[PDB]
Design a protein around this ligand. Structure first.
Ligand SMILES: O=C(O)CCCCCOc1ccccc1CN(Cc1ccccc1)C(=O)c1ccc(-c2ccsc2)cc1
Length: 260
């Protein structure tokens, strides 16, 4: 019963996401390194990006350009997370408006967790694993763009120290999205009941896949709390960019996510 619930979620994870954590870490341990303006120009003229540079909004400056590449990945990851959730029968049985509520308030927590896999202390992978942007370069961008990036590195390296595999992540992501505390949810008891079953699946999976791990499941529940604070800080910083970087465009889907 529950063993099949989990594997249904695991198959949805493998089907709807392109790069696994296993692949990400193997690459991280070669990609073209982006560490300065010159290598960023070469990467944009040399590497193959999911989003064609010509499709981005008009050029404004280096910091803004990186910010647009950031939006490309988060919007692409929202797309995959939406198909991942829709491949979960219990998620698809909710009314469409509750599905949107859960994605609206959940995808960024999910993004900052799942994409921790492509990050290490030195930087993170870009361009489908073909590039590697250095943390030092991202820190050298001008405020406020350097400010929004650093907190995610601190989380990702502490998160990666838990050594979750893709099977753990699949359940963990499902649990983030199916969260009963999201504002404006219609059928709270149903979402709460689904989240509880996912968490029960998570614990059963962990104690089998990580029999010698100490306190791993409560450690992950604390990371769910951390992610909420991370996203809260992120949304505050995004509202400051909207306010004072009027020249910077925001993808319409993210405008809808941050509309409040
Ligand atoms: O709110 C939104 O969704 C839009 C506003 C996002 C602003 C904050 O974005 C980031 C902050 C910290 C780290 C990474 C990202 C963005 N990001 C997702 C992510 C990956 C790991 C962990 C958490 C998130 C990326 O994958 C990424 C893609 C491209 C580049 C790049 C390309 C050429 S020069 C730089 C750099 C990063």
């Amino acid at each position: 019963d529950l063993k099949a619930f989990s594997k249904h979620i695991y198959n949805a994870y493998l089907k709807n996401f392109n790069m696994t954590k296993k692949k990400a870490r193997s690459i991280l341990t070669a990609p073209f390194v982006i560490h300065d303006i010159e290598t960023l120009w070469q990467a944009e003229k040399g590497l193959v990006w999911k989003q064609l540079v010509n499709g981005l909004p008009p050029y404004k400056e280096i910091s803004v350009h990186v910010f647009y590449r950031c939006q490309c990945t988060t919007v692409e990851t929202v797309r995959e997370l939406t198909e991942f959730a829709k491949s979960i029968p219990s998620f698809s049985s909710l009314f469409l408006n509750d599905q949107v509520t859960l994605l609206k308030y959940g995808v960024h927590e999910a993004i900052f967790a799942m994409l921790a896999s492509i990050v290490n202390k030195d930087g993170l992978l870009v361009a489908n694993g073909s590039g590697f942007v250095t943390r030092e370069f991202l820190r050298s961008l001008r405020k406020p763009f350097s400010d929004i990036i650093e907190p995610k590195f601190e989380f990702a390296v502490k998160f990666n120290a838990l050594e979750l595999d893709d099977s753990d992540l699949a359940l963990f992501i499902a649990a983030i999205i199916l969260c009963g505390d999201r504002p404006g949810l219609m059928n709270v008891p149903r979402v709460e009941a689904i989240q509880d079953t996912i968490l029960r699946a998570l614990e059963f999976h962990l104690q089998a896949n990580h029999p010698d791990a100490q306190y791993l499941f409560p450690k992950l529940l604390q990371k769910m709390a951390d992610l909420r604070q991370l996203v809260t800080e992120h949304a505050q910083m995004m509202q400051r960019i909207k306010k004072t970087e009027t020249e910077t465009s925001l993808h319409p889907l993210l405008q809808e996510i941050y509309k409040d």
